[PDB]
Write a protein that binds this ligand. Structure first.
Ligand SMILES: Cc1cc2nc3c(=O)[nH]c(=O)nc-3n(C[C@H](O)[C@H](O)[C@H](O)COP(=O)(O)O)c2cc1C
Ligand SMILES: Cc1cc2nc3c(=O)[nH]c(=O)nc-3n(C[C@H](O)[C@H](O)[C@H](O)COP(=O)(O)O)c2cc1C
Ligand SMILES: [Cl-]
Ligand SMILES: [Cl-]
Lengths: 173, 172
């Protein structure tokens, strides 16, 4: 099988999805790592809504373009559970849920699933449509399915990323 | 080894050997910070690799870093990151956390123990590393070699709530 960098390179953003549904067996594997993931203080504030049926897909579609993906997971963070930093009041809500989302997205990739991470949504429409209580904030939508065209190349990053030297320095800025 | 095995075997290490992290392994860890996606491909992450005395001592002023031999301070650039117009929410924590997660998983594959740290004094970090106002320190990822036997990959039955408490289908 592939090593981690090969997996990380293979993953790309898919916006062209087949009709084909995600097999229950693959969805369950994707979910398992949402639990295995670490969270600040082990607080486990992540709250997931698995969406693969028509009403929910339509509800998400009121808030975002989900590109006819056959499966979406709405990842919320529970601010009643999350750790809060004493110095400045910063809450780990986005961090914890993103670790969870990233773990899912990598696991989905291993299983041959295409995906795209979606933050371009109207959070108010999501709150209303899914009747979210005040303590749950919708953070990420992860879409998954089967690519309908040609996957992006695992060696594209020379063209799609800035050089490493532009994001890393040593000891000081 | 498959992905779930890698994610299971990762745990939070709080006691490290003196052994330094080899350059070859650090470079592989950094490689995935670039590979990782960010919202809009904005690539706002700004990393400071800390493996020398002064920098390790600066971190220790701000946080408990468990005498780790290597730290990466992961900042987000507010001048690059997307700000969502609807509500003003910035992707700073999201984009940086994808990067940091990729790094932590890569470190684990290479036999490096690690711990993610957010319990740090951000004003101390800002001052000590002379961060400009556009750079927000988000995560400190610590790495090295574990001093004792790692935590079990099969521990999650005890160290996590049931999947049923975090997942529902279609509706809450
Ligand atoms: C936090 C985050 C939010 C994103 N939001 C969206 C989104 O709302 N819609 C979309 O089509 N793609 C979205 N993207 C996908 C990015 O455009 C993509 O990751 C980036 O351009 C790099 O492309 P690649 O993933 O194919 O390497 C998002 C990605 C990230 C990491
Ligand atoms: C966002 C985040 C911030 C964390 N901050 C700290 C920290 O400041 N200090 C620390 O000792 N552990 C920190 N942890 C480690 C967690 O306590 C740990 O991941 C959790 O208790 C689960 O244990 P495990 O990682 O061994 O499975 C952090 C973890 C995450 C994900
Ligand atoms: Cl985007
Ligand atoms: Cl032991």
């Amino acid at each position: 099988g592939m090593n981690f960098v090969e997996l990380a390179k293979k993953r790309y953003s898919c916006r062209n999805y087949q009709d084909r549904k995600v097999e229950k067996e693959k969805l369950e594997k994707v979910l398992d790592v949402a639990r295995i993931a670490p969270t600040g203080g082990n607080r486990q504030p992540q709250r997931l809504i698995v969406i693969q049926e028509k009403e929910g897909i339509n509800k998400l579609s009121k808030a975002a373009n989900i590109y006819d993906a056959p499966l979406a997971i709405l990842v919320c963070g529970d601010k009643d559970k999350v750790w809060t930093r004493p110095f400045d009041g910063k809450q780990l809500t986005d961090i914890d849920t993103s670790i969870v989302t990233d773990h899912m997205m990598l696991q989905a990739t291993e299983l041959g699933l295409a995906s795209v991470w979606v933050c371009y949504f109207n959070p108010d429409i999501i709150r209303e449509e899914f009747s979210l209580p005040d303590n749950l904030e919708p953070i990420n939508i992860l879409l998954m399915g089967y690519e309908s065209k040609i996957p992006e190349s695992p060696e594209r990053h020379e063209k799609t990323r800035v050089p490493l030297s532009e994001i890393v320095s040593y000891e000081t800025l």
